[PDB]
């Protein structure tokens, strides 16, 4: 009787008969540390043993503090980043994933809103990719469930909107093979998740009610950033993913238009002006003493995704690679043609002056202008004389501002001049 | 329909029919009786689990539990029984236990449905506010712990203190401990959100803390000299004897070292190795009716009754001990190394009889000095006192015995000693007649 | 008394459930509950409880489980979890490991051998109930293992001698209540590496001729299976250590042979990464 | 704060000083005969150093009277004890403590 | 041991566990019954001195395995997984084809009697789920895999293909279906379409025809993609060989369903979507040649 006894008995009998099987199974677990690094390996093994002991049980109030202390102790490890193969074969990522499942539980409860272990572990596991990409390959299998439970709110930057998308972004950082291995259903999932952000906003920051933090909303930009990471590469634009991404995005209208009429929307010529008139002088809320940057940042992220989604011309296929249809479709989304006036305006106002006046909170960022010029270069380009004869410059007001803001001052400079310098560095429109 | 105290003959109250229905329902939810074959047992378990899940889904999305709670209006032992009909809650405990058992069985199901009894506070505190039965709560907590532990965070410090207090006002039933075992790790299935909080909270309450003792074994030694004091026909009232100790090293096993030279009350103190709620006592000066004398401390029943005397020290090597006896005027003084100590004892057990006794522990060596050639008195007896030799019976030789115990350490022979306290049976008194 | 519980059925159940509660409260590692439990039950009391013969079977198993859950719970669990990693460091003392002790290809004794793996630190605690910040610890008291091993060996020999006679009256309760906790304690002491070479030799000689020859119940067979699995795991560990010991010399020879052949076209000639490195 | 009832003869010349370890083999005891901890069943010396207040001040106040080789009976006021609640789990609140401290060696 | 496996499979779990012991012992049994090489090997050996002895030894080994109740174990393990493709189902099907080699009739009779006397419903539903969970050529996956690290396998990520998720599993499942119905077993042929004793009826025939239509459509789409090229790639050769083998196994299974004269099965074939599949196959062949 007692079937556990006979189960263990026959397990032992088979394992002692098939010693070769135990030998081949045990070998991948084995590693080899050389000499001096024994001491720093012992502490890592003790910390991982403590983590594994706390894995089976759940976490509470003091247990989170203990886990964070253990993680702070394990971060200052010499052989953590020196032996990635040991790190992969030691099975830490499975432990962190199981801890994440235990923390989330059933879901839609959020008993403890403090994800800081997951971001640090994922970033430090995905920073190295020149050696042992098999860790990223392993995380690619968990990526489906990771995208399934993409909750809002990350404690590390005190932003909300997407908790675990940093792990996915680090997983598709600079891997063309991993980007090609992406499928359709997860892209559909993230498209439907993005489509749910079409609800209008009444206050400066509110999810359902009773606002607590009203600094800056970013809940609509994380999905666009993840799509941009999944559609582009180090120096190439993957067409296979771009086609399905643009087909899914264009199949249904999800970008709400707060100033246009009828179906569709996406009117820059009115929404950008509304954002710069509601965010420059007033606060993120309408009634405010003298939306916010969220709407304009969302539009810039969407523009960047669309620009990087456009196929590269005169590099692989130039008019003989089916890209004509998708180029015409992107051109059809004119308001999109007439974005030069949008790129011309300079709604920053440096203010400052004589009596100190430091720091800016509601300043227009040149990165959005860089996004507009990148989209223009990707879709239309400056290969024709008409654009040069219409513009003659990347911008009059920004260039005049850069020329004027040239002084050896610790207050007038080193606050906005760096952003303008980066924007000018990223401007390649006069090139080619 | 009869909740609002309506007239009884207007609408019937069929207690017999509802009792029969409840009995049929409880026998209808019988456990599968696993002693039979595996196939039929598995079929019955599968049918029961599917039935319970479907009954759950049909029943308490918005009903069933509300009906049961509205049914639980029995808050008095016999007032509501007398008010409505002849009796109402004649068998409330059994039906409550069976209803909670079937509720927990429904909650178990296919290990995928635990919401109402594990994700709420009002129903849990309604269960905990009565505390009459513990079968249902144990079953639901065990099933939640097996499936997915999330009902232990509801249990706060107040509920733990209430459950522990059940062992105080109400006697032990071994079911409370089997419940508290389910509020712990249970070999792997644990959650440190609040279960470890209450586990740490079990300790400072001190209503669950238990005390264990570990004492060395001691024996009492008495000689054959019997005083035989009576009333009206008394013969002798003065006695004096001394004892010597050479090897008296302490700390042989622990602090529990017993070495007493005084006397204990014959009535009240008996050679019993244990017993009693107050740690009992198996030596001289151990019970409440004795006093004891180790030379320094005279406790009785864990009561501090130490004496004050110059040059206080243990009964070390070359330390004499003397004893004084009186019967007319109670005056007992103890002298060590020629210096009498304080702590005069008055009004002892005059009525009855008492014998010279001495207690000892392991690793001790004591000598008996009663007088004559057998005992050489180190110090002279006090004036008005006599040595413990005149009470020697003729046609016999004085010696030591086993102090009316059962059996010593014998290797081959196995003898049994019957009831014989002393030479007589009824009373230990002489026979003066006229 | 202490033995009067063999008649009172209800009090025996009360005490057995109290011991079960004590085991359950302090388990899977705990900080301050273990010390408070050690306040109630001490080393000599536990030693007498495990060494007694007339003690009831239920209380014997309860006290054994209490001792294991207090002292030998966290460290044994940690060692069991780590036992599937096989991290072998390379030092000057890790090269003198062979598959066989001699040239006769003898199988040898599985228990006795040279591991040189990364074993965890055995750091106990000495609180004496007057201290602070006592959280990182293994054992609340200091059990003397020198006498504990001797006691365990003596009781195991007495138990196997009694079971060889097949007495009608067992030690405690029945034939399994005296034998299951003893093997449980022996197994949880052997997996921690407490036993020395001579104790391992005595244990192996105990069962070589035999413990597996008489009739045993189911839980004893479970414990025997666990012990055999541990022995086979130790054999696998010795094999892995020998394999990596040979592999160090083999890869050194391969690197030397590759350095002997001159084949380099990179600008950084005579580099270390030219032997075994992706880039 | 503490009452010293000597239960063993002492020389009275050698006294424990500050800055050195003291070997003490004591046996704790609660009220009415209950005890909770003994330091001699473990068969290990208990060494503590004076200056960092790592031990309760009752021992420091009680060891300043008796000498080496002298066993004494000690009583601890709840005010001089851990506090109003004492040690959680082994000491009940507002309860005195009884000790059997003994000095054997001084280093 | 067989009783242990049967009672583990009978107890409900709503989840397929790993059970490495079951995998190891199923592999051991399958290798024990796999004495034959199923190839040419040596020269033309005489076909009665060794062939009869080989058949007798195979029958003896199958009797040794199935006299302890291996067939009931296999059926219960198949019915345990509610149409979920898993490695344990693959091991169970390997054991089934190992004990069903040679068209044995005693095991077929035992399985039919067990299914009739137990009124099992999960077996056919599990088979339908396994058929619906099978894989195809996945032309998009092949196109994505062709362009990797510039061109080819420069990244050297691994030796995997990711072009046919289950081909050996599908071949084993259909070989099990063919062997289970081999020998013109009329009652078993009719039991896969009607299930008179069962309360719920599941048609395995229509599911097999649907899978054949799916693989025919996949092959036609692959041909239409590859019609513009001229040279055959090695990956193309391997994918073509796998698809041809799967189609051949499905065709053999369909032949064994209607090999004997069975009016009901023939009418079910006629009223199904077979003709479109055959039309597509002929269209593929006319240009493949």
HSE, CB side, 13 Å, CA atoms: give it for residue D84. Answer: 0
Neighbours of B28 (CB within 10 A): 9
Of the partner residues D5, D41, D88, the one whose CB lies closest to the CB of residue B204: D88
Which residues from A are below 8 Å from C88, CB to CB?
30-32
Task: Supply angle C-alpha D43, D47, D50, rounded to 5.
Answer: 160
Three-state DSSP state, B358 = strand
Per the CB < 8 A criterion, the answer to whether C160 and C48 are in contact is no
Which residues from C are below 8 Å from A56, CB to CB?
28
Instruction: For residue D32, give the DSSP letter.
Output: G
Three-state DSSP state, D5 = strand
- The packing angle between helices E87-99 and E20-33, to 10°, is 30
D100 a catalytic residue: no
Per the CB < 8 A criterion, the answer to whether E173 and E156 are in contact is no
DSSP codes joined into one string, A169-183: HHHTSS-HHHHHT--
Q: Which residue of C has its CA nearest to B171?
A: C14
**Given CB atoms, is B37 within the 8 Å cutoff of chain E?**
no
**Token pair belonging to E75:** 């059926």
Instruction: For residue E37, give the DSSP letter.
Output: -
- In terms of Cα–Cα distance, which of C191, C188, C179 is closest to C218? C179
Secondary element (H or E) of residue B244: strand B242-245
Per the CB < 8 A criterion, the answer to whether C97 and C114 are in contact is yes
D36 a catalytic residue: yes
Cα–Cα distance between A112 and A59 in angstroms, integer?
10
Q: Is C86 exposed, middle or buried (0-12, 13-18, 19+ CB in 10 A)?
A: buried
D46 a catalytic residue: no
Cα–Cα distance between E264 and E258 in angstroms, integer?
9
- The packing angle between helices E87-99 and E70-80, to 10°, is 150
Q: Which residues contact E170 (CB under 8 A, 6 or more apart)?
A: E134, E135, E246, E249
Long-range (24+ apart) CB contacts under 8 A made by E200-207 are E200/E121, E202/E124, E202/E125, E202/E127, E202/E128, E203/E268, E204/E124, E204/E127, E204/E128, E204/E177, E205/E257, E205/E265, E205/E268, E205/E269, E205/E272, E206/E268, E206/E272, E207/E127, E207/E128, E207/E131, E207/E132
Neighbours of E94 (CB within 10 A): 23
Label residue B377 left, alpha or beta by phi (over 0 means left) and psi (-120 to 50 means alpha): beta
Place of tokens 């089934």: E96
Where b means 16+ CB within 10 Å and e means fewer, B346-371 reads eebeeeebbbbbbbbbeebebebbbb
As a 3-state breakdown, chain D gives helix, strand, coil percent values, each rounded to 5, of 10, 30, 65
Instruction: For residue A214, give the DSSP letter.
Output: -
Of the partner residues A52, A53, A131, the one whose CB lies closest to the CB of residue C278: A131
**Across the interface, do C36 and B199 touch by the CB < 8 Å criterion?**
no
**Token pair belonging to B193:** 């959100």
> Neighbouring chains of E at 3+ CB pairs within 8 Å?
A, B
CA of E145: how far to CAs of A168, A183, A188, A321, in Å?
21, 12, 21, 19
Per the CB < 8 A criterion, the answer to whether B136 and B65 are in contact is no
**Across the interface, do C144 and D43 touch by the CB < 8 Å criterion?**
yes
Cα–Cα distance between B152 and B148 in angstroms, integer?
10
Q: What is the 3-state secondary structure (H, E, C) of B55-98?
A: HHHHHCCCCCHHHHHHHCCCCCCCHHHHHCCCCCCCCHHHHHHH
**Across the interface, do B185 and C27 touch by the CB < 8 Å criterion?**
yes
B 182-201 residues with CB below 8 A of C?
184-188, 190, 199-200
Domain of D16, in residue numbers: 1-107
DSSP codes joined into one string, B170-235: S---SHHHHHHHHTS-STT---TTTHHHHHHHTTTT-SS----------EEE-BS------SSS--
- The sign of the CA dihedral C197, C203, C208, C209 is positive
**Given CB atoms, is A36 within the 8 Å cutoff of chain C?**
no
Instruction: For residue C97, give the DSSP letter.
Output: -
Taking the alpha carbons at both ends of chain B, their separation in whole angstroms is 92
Label residue E107 left, alpha or beta by phi (over 0 means left) and psi (-120 to 50 means alpha): alpha
D56 a catalytic residue: yes
**Across the interface, do C78 and A49 touch by the CB < 8 Å criterion?**
yes
Q: Write phi, then psi, for A123 (nearest 5 degrees).
A: -65, -40
Cα–Cα distance between B212 and B335 in angstroms, integer?
37
Please indicate the experimental technique that yielded this structure. Answer: cryo-EM
Cα–Cα distance between A107 and E157 in angstroms, integer?
35
Structural Rg of chain B based on CA atoms: 36
Per the CB < 8 A criterion, the answer to whether A390 and A384 are in contact is no
**Across the interface, do E148 and A177 touch by the CB < 8 Å criterion?**
yes
- The sign of the CA dihedral E89, E91, E94, E98 is negative
Beta bridge partners of B360: B219
Three-state DSSP state, E109 = helix
- The Cα of D89 is separated from the nearest Cα of chain B by a number of Å equal to 5
Regarding beta strands D72-76 and B219-221, do their DSSP bridges make them parallel or antiparallel, or are they unpaired? unpaired
- The sign of the CA dihedral C37, C39, C43, C45 is negative
* Helix/strand number for chain C, H first, E second: 9, 0
A 57-116 residues with CB below 8 A of C?
57, 86, 90
Where are the extended beta strands (E) located within C74-115? none
Which residues from A are below 8 Å from B150, CB to CB?
105
Per the residue annotation, which of D26, D59, D91, D100 is the catalytic one? Answer: D26
* Helix/strand number for chain B, H first, E second: 10, 7
**Token pair belonging to B62:** 């918005």
Task: Supply angle C-alpha B261, B266, B270, rounded to 5.
Answer: 90
Cα–Cα distance between A133 and C278 in angstroms, integer?
13
- The packing angle between helices A38-56 and A92-104, to 10°, is 30
**Across the interface, do E10 and B46 touch by the CB < 8 Å criterion?**
no
Cα–Cα distance between C144 and D44 in angstroms, integer?
10
**Across the interface, do B196 and A56 touch by the CB < 8 Å criterion?**
no
Per the residue annotation, which of D15, D46, D48, D82 is the catalytic one? Answer: D82
**Across the interface, do E1 and A137 touch by the CB < 8 Å criterion?**
no
- In terms of Cα–Cα distance, which of A83, A90, A87 is closest to A33? A83
Label residue B221 left, alpha or beta by phi (over 0 means left) and psi (-120 to 50 means alpha): beta
Three-state DSSP state, B335 = strand
Where are the extended beta strands (E) located within E145-283? none
Cα–Cα distance between E283 and E289 in angstroms, integer?
11
Cα–Cα distance between A170 and A226 in angstroms, integer?
10
Per the CB < 8 A criterion, the answer to whether C4 and C56 are in contact is no
**Across the interface, do D36 and C33 touch by the CB < 8 Å criterion?**
no
Instruction: For residue C52, give the DSSP letter.
Output: -
Place of tokens 């019957």: B418
- In terms of Cα–Cα distance, which of D76, D81, D68 is closest to D24? D68
D26 a catalytic residue: yes
CA of B32: how far to CAs of B42, B95, B102, B143, E12, in Å?
8, 20, 14, 17, 15
**Token pair belonging to B407:** 């059996």
Chains A and D touch (3+ CB pairs under 8 A): no
Per the CB < 8 A criterion, the answer to whether B49 and B110 are in contact is yes
As a 3-state breakdown, chain E gives helix, strand, coil percent values, each rounded to 5, of 65, 0, 35
Per the CB < 8 A criterion, the answer to whether A153 and A163 are in contact is yes
**Token pair belonging to A241:** 């993913």
- In terms of Cα–Cα distance, which of E152, E159, E166, E133 is closest to E242? E166
Which residues from A are below 8 Å from B185, CB to CB?
57
Taking the alpha carbons at both ends of chain D, their separation in whole angstroms is 27
**Given CB atoms, is E155 within the 8 Å cutoff of chain A?**
yes
Q: Which residue of A has its CA nearest to C225?
A: A9
Which residues from A are below 8 Å from E21, CB to CB?
7, 10-11, 14
Cα–Cα distance between B314 and B299 in angstroms, integer?
15
Q: Write phi, then psi, for D23 (nearest 5 degrees).
A: -90, 120
Secondary element (H or E) of residue E254: helix E234-257
Q: Write phi, then psi, for C92 (nearest 5 degrees).
A: -75, -20
**Token pair belonging to C91:** 């030092």
Three-state DSSP state, D24 = strand
Cα–Cα distance between A346 and A343 in angstroms, integer?
8
- The Cα of D40 is separated from the nearest Cα of chain C by a number of Å equal to 10
CATH number of the domain to which D62 belongs? 3.10.50.40
**Given CB atoms, is E36 within the 8 Å cutoff of chain A?**
no
Instruction: For residue C272, give the DSSP letter.
Output: G
Total structural domains within chain D? 1
- The packing angle between helices E234-257 and E168-180, to 10°, is 20
- In terms of Cα–Cα distance, which of C197, C195, C198 is closest to C187? C195
Instruction: For residue A382, give the DSSP letter.
Output: S
Of the partner residues D42, D56, D89, the one whose CB lies closest to the CB of residue C142: D42
**Across the interface, do C120 and A2 touch by the CB < 8 Å criterion?**
no
Which residues from B are below 8 Å from C41, CB to CB?
212
Q: Is D107 exposed, middle or buried (0-12, 13-18, 19+ CB in 10 A)?
A: exposed
Cα–Cα distance between D27 and D100 in angstroms, integer?
5
Three-state DSSP state, D46 = strand
Beta bridge partners of C87: A31
**Token pair belonging to C164:** 């060889």
Per the CB < 8 A criterion, the answer to whether A178 and A140 are in contact is yes
D37 a catalytic residue: yes
CA of C134: how far to CAs of C35, C130, E22, in Å?
10, 10, 47
Q: Which residues contact B413 (CB under 8 A, 6 or more apart)?
A: none
Beta bridge partners of D29: D98
Secondary element (H or E) of residue E243: helix E234-257
DSSP codes joined into one string, C118-147: -PPP------TT--S---S-S-SS---HHH
**Token pair belonging to A324:** 């004509």
Beta bridge partners of B400: B223
Per the CB < 8 A criterion, the answer to whether A100 and A118 are in contact is yes
Per the CB < 8 A criterion, the answer to whether B203 and C33 are in contact is yes
**Given CB atoms, is B122 within the 8 Å cutoff of chain E?**
no
**Token pair belonging to A343:** 């790129």
**Token pair belonging to B112:** 């995928």
Beta bridge partners of D72: D6
Which residues from D are below 8 Å from B279, CB to CB?
33
Q: Which residues contact A108 (CB under 8 A, 6 or more apart)?
A: none
**Across the interface, do A53 and C29 touch by the CB < 8 Å criterion?**
yes
């Amino acid at each position: 009787e007692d079937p556990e006894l006979v189960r263990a008995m026959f397990v032992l009998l088979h394992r002692q008969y098939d010693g070769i099987g135990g030998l081949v199974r045990a070998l991948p677990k084995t590693y080899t540390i050389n000499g001096v690094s024994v001491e720093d390996t012992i502490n890592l093994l003790a910390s991982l043993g403590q983590i594994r002991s706390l894995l089976s049980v759940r976490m509470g109030k003091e247990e989170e503090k203990l886990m964070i202390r253990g993680l702070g102790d394990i971060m200052n490890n010499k052989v953590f980043y020196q032996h990635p193969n040991l790190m992969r074969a030691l099975g830490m990522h499975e432990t962190v994933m199981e801890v994440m499942v235990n923390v989330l539980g059933g879901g839609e409860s959020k008993e403890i809103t403090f994800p800081k272990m997951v971001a640090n572990c994922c970033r430090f596991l995905c920073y190295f990719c020149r050696i042992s990409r098999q860790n990223q390959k392993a995380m690619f299998d968990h990526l489906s469930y990771l995208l399934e439970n993409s909750s809002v709110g990350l404690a590390s930057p005190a932003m909300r909107g997407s908790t675990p998308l940093d792990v996915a972004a680090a997983s598709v950082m600079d891997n063309n093979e991993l980007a090609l291995a992406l499928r359709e259903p997860d892209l559909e999932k993230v498209v439907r998740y993005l489509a749910g952000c079409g609800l209008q906003s009444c206050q400066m920051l509110v999810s359902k009610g009773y606002p607590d933090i009203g600094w800056n909303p970013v809940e609509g930009e994380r999905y666009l950033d993840f799509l941009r990471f999944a559609v582009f590469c180090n120096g190439e634009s993957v067409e296979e993913n771009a086609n399905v991404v643009v087909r899914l995005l264009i199949r249904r209208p999800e970008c709400f238009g707060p100033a246009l009429r009828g179906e569709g929307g996406n009117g820059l010529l009115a929404a950008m002006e509304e954002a710069i008139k509601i965010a420059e002088d007033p606060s993120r809320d309408g009634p405010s003493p003298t939306m916010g940057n969220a709407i304009m940042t969302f539009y810039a992220a969407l523009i960047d995704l669309l620009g990087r989604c456009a196929p590269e011309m005169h590099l692989i296929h130039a008019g003989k690679g089916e890209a004509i249809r998708i180029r015409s479709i992107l051109r059809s989304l004119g308001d999109l043609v007439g974005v030069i006036s949008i790129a011309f305006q300079m709604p920053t106002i440096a203010k400052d002056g004589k009596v100190v006046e430091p720091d800016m909170s509601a300043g227009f960022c040149p990165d959005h202008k860089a996004a507009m010029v990148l989209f223009l270069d990707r879709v239309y380009g400056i290969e024709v004389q008409d654009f040069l004869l219409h513009l003659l410059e990347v911008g009059f007001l920004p260039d005049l501002r850069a020329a004027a803001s040239l002084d050896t001052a610790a207050l007038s400079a080193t606050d906005m001049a760096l952003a303008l310098n980066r924007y000018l560095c990223t401007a390649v429109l006069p090139l080619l | 329909a009869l909740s609002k105290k309506v007239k009884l003959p207007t609408i019937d109250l069929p207690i017999e029919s509802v009792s029969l229905s409840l009995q049929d329902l409880i026998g209808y939810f019988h456990p599968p009786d696993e002693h039979l074959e595996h196939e039929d047992k598995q079929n019955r378990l599968r049918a029961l689990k599917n039935r319970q899940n479907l009954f759950q889904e049909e029943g308490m999305i918005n009903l069933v539990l509300e009906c049961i709670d509205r049914l639980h209006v029995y808050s008095s032992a016999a007032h509501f029984a007398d008010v409505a009909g002849r009796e109402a809650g004649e068998s409330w405990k059994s039906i409550l236990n069976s209803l909670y058992e079937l509720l927990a069985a429904l909650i178990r199901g296919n290990r995928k449905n635990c919401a109402q009894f594990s994700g709420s506070l009002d129903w849990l505190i309604s269960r905990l506010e009565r505390l009459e039965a513990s079968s249902g709560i144990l079953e639901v907590l065990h099933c939640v712990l097996v499936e997915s532990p999330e009902a232990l965070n509801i249990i706060k410090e107040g509920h733990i203190k209430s459950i522990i207090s059940l062992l105080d006002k109400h006697g032990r039933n071994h079911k409370v401990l089997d419940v508290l075992c389910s509020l712990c790790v249970c070999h792997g299935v644990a959650v440190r959100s609040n279960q470890h909080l209450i586990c740490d909270n079990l300790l400072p309450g001190r209503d669950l803390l238990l005390q264990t003792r570990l004492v060395n074994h001691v024996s009492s030694m008495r000689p054959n000299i019997f005083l035989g004091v009576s009333e009206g026909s008394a013969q002798y009232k003065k006695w004096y004897y001394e004892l010597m100790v050479d090897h008296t090293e302490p700390f042989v096993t622990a602090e529990a070292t017993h070495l007493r030279v005084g006397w204990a009350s014959t009535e009240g103190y008996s050679p019993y190795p244990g017993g009693g709620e107050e740690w009992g006592g198996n030596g001289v000066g151990d019970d409440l009716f004795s006093y004891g004398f180790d030379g320094l401390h005279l406790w009785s029943g864990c009561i501090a009754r130490t004496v004050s005397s110059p040059n206080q020290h243990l009964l070390r090597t070359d330390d004499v001990i003397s004893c004084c006896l009186d019967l007319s005027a109670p005056s007992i003084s103890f002298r060590i190394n020629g210096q009498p100590v304080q702590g005069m004892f008055e009004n002892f057990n005059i009525d009855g009889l008492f014998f010279p006794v001495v207690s000892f522990s392991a690793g001790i060596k004591v000598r008996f000095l009663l007088g004559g050639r057998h005992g050489e008195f180190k110090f002279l007896p006090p004036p008005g006192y006599a040595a413990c030799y005149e009470a020697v019976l003729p046609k016999e030789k004085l010696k030591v015995e086993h102090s009316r115990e059962y059996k010593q350490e014998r290797t081959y022979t196995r003898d049994l000693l019957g009831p014989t306290v002393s030479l007589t049976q009824a009373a230990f008194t002489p026979v003066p007649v006229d | 008394d202490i033995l009067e519980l063999t008649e009172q059925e209800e009090l025996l159940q009360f005490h057995y459930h109290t011991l079960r509660l004590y085991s359950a409260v302090c388990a899977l590692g705990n900080h301050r509950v273990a010390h408070a439990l050690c306040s109630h039950v001490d080393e000599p009391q536990l030693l007498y409880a495990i060494e007694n013969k007339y003690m009831p079977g239920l209380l014997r198993a309860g006290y054994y489980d209490l001792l294991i859950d207090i002292h030998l719970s966290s460290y044994a669990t940690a060692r069991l979890m780590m036992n599937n990693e096989f991290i072998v460091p390379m030092t000057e003392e890790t090269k003198s490991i062979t598959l066989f002790p001699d040239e006769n290809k003898k199988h040898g004794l599985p228990g006795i051998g040279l591991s040189t793996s990364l074993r965890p630190r055995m750091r106990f605690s000495s609180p004496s109930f007057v201290s602070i910040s006592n959280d990182c610890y293994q054992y609340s008291p200091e059990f003397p293992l020198d006498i504990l091993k001797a006691k365990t060996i003596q009781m195991l020999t007495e138990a196997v001698k009694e079971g060889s006679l097949h007495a009608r009256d067992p030690v405690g309760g029945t034939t399994e209540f005296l034998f299951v906790p003893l093997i449980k304690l022996f197994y949880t002491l052997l997996i921690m590496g407490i036993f020395h070479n001579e104790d391992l030799k005595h244990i192996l000689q105990l069962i070589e001729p035999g413990l597996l020859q008489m009739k045993l119940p189911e839980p004893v067979k479970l414990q025997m299976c666990l012990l055999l699995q541990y022995l086979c795991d130790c054999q696998v560990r010795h094999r892995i250590e020998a394999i990596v010991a040979f592999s160090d010399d083999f890869v050194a020879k391969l690197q030397d042979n590759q350095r002997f052949r001159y084949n380099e076209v990179m600008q950084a000639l005579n580099m270390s990464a030219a032997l075994t490195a992706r880039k | 704060g503490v009452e010293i009832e000597t239960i063993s003869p002492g020389d009275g010349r050698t006294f424990p000083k500050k800055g050195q370890t003291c070997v003490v083999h004591y046996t704790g005891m609660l009220q009415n005969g209950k005890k909770f901890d003994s330091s001699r069943d473990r068969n290990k010396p208990f060494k503590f150093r004076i200056g960092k207040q790592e031990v309760i001040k009752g021992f420091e106040e009680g060891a300043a009277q008796m000498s080496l080789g002298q066993r004494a009976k000690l009583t601890c006021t709840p005010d001089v004890a851990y506090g109003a609640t004492g040690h959680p789990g082994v000491i009940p609140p507002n309860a005195t403590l009884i000790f059997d401290v003994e000095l054997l060696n001084l280093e | 041991l067989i009783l242990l496996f049967s009672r583990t499979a009978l107890t409900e779990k709503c989840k397929l566990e790993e059970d490495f012991l079951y995998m190891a012992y199923a592999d051991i049994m399958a290798k024990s019954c796999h004495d034959e090489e199923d190839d040419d090997g040596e020269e033309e050996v005489k076909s009665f001195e060794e062939k009869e002895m080989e058949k007798q030894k195979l029958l003896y080994q199958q009797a040794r395995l199935h006299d302890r109740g291996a067939a009931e174990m296999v059926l219960q393990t198949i019915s345990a997984s509610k149409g979920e493709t898993g490695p344990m189902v693959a091991a169970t099907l390997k054991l089934g084809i190992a004990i069903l080699n040679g068209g044995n009739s005693t095991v077929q009779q035992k399985m039919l009697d067990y299914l009739k006397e137990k009124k099992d419903v999960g077996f056919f539903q599990s088979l339908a789920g396994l058929m619906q969970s099978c894989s195809v050529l996945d032309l998009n996956a092949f196109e994505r895999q062709n362009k990797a690290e510039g061109l080819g396998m420069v990244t050297e990520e691994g030796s995997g293909e990711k072009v046919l998720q289950d081909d050996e599993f599908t071949c084993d499942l259909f070989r099990f279906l063919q062997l289970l119905c081999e020998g013109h077993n009329s009652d078993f042929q009719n039991y896969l379409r009607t299930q008179t004793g069962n309360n719920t009826t599941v048609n395995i025939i229509i599911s097999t025809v649907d899978y054949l239509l799916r693989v025919q459509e996949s092959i036609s789409d692959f041909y239409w993609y590859y019609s513009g090229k001229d040279i055959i790639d090695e990956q193309g050769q391997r994918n073509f060989s796998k698809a041809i083998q799967v189609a051949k196994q499905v065709f053999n299974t369909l032949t064994e369903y209607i090999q004997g004269p069975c009016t009901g099965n023939q009418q079910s074939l006629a009223h199904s979507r077979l003709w479109d599949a055959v039309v597509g196959f002929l269209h593929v062949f006319a240009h493949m040649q």
